[PDB]
Design brief:
The complex is a heterodimer of chains A (6) and B (119). In chain A, 0% of the residues lie in helices and 0% in strands. Chain A is elongated and about 15 Å long. By secondary structure, chain A is largely without helices or strands. The termini of chain A are far apart. By secondary structure, chain B is mostly helical. Chain B is built from 4 helices and 2 strands; from the N terminus they run ααββαα. Chain B has a two-stranded antiparallel sheet with strand order 1-2. In chain B, helix 1 runs parallel beside helix 3 and helix 2 packs antiparallel against helix 3. The radius of gyration of chain B is 14 Å and the shape is globular. The chains are: A little secondary structure (6), B mainly alpha (119). Chains A and B meet through loops of A and helix 1 of B. Bound molecules: calcium ion. Calcium ion (CA) binds next to helix 2 of chain B. Chain B: GO terms for molecular function: calcium ion binding; calcium-dependent phospholipase A2 activity; phospholipid binding; signaling receptor binding. Chain B: It is an enzyme of class 3 (hydrolase). Chain B: It is found in: Secreted. Chain B: PLA2 catalyzes the calcium-dependent hydrolysis of the 2-acyl groups in 3-sn-phosphoglycerides.
Chain lengths: 6, 119
């Protein structure tokens, strides 16, 4: 999910 | 952490690209407000709320906290070596991944306009 990795 | 959650999703929903869950409805993904659009979005709303609660623990950063878990033979198990933050975040991620497996997927709800539809 979310791909707000960094 | 996010990478681990992605792996839970790959493990519980192997028929679909994990990316399918990365931008869906008002809550699966970047978004975290509004009326959830359907069952899958409700899985993501509960997950979002779960993270917000876990964040109240000092030093607990749900996107970044590396926890201890296994996914084998169809079953997620948050392990006993987890501290309170790890256990909470792992459990959020666990029941979300399980929720996704039982949720219908509506192609219309992929990549929706959060600003317009999630107030
Ligand atoms: Ca979210």
């Amino acid at each position: 999910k979310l791909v707000f990795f960094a | 952490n996010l990478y681990q959650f992605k792996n839970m999703i790959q493990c519980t929903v192997p028929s679909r690209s994990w990316a399918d869950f990365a931008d869906y409805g008002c809550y699966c993904g970047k978004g975290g407000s509004g009326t959830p659009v359907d069952d899958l979005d409700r899985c993501c709303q509960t997950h979002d709320n779960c993270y917000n609660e876990a964040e109240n623990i000092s030093g607990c950063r749900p996107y970044f906290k590396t926890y201890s878990y296994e996914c084998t033979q169809g079953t997620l198990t948050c392990k006993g070596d987890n501290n309170a933050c790890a256990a909470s975040v792992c459990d959020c991620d666990r029941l979300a991944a399980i929720c996704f497996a039982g949720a219908p997927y509506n192609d219309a709800n992929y990549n929706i306009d959060l600003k317009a539809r999630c107030n």
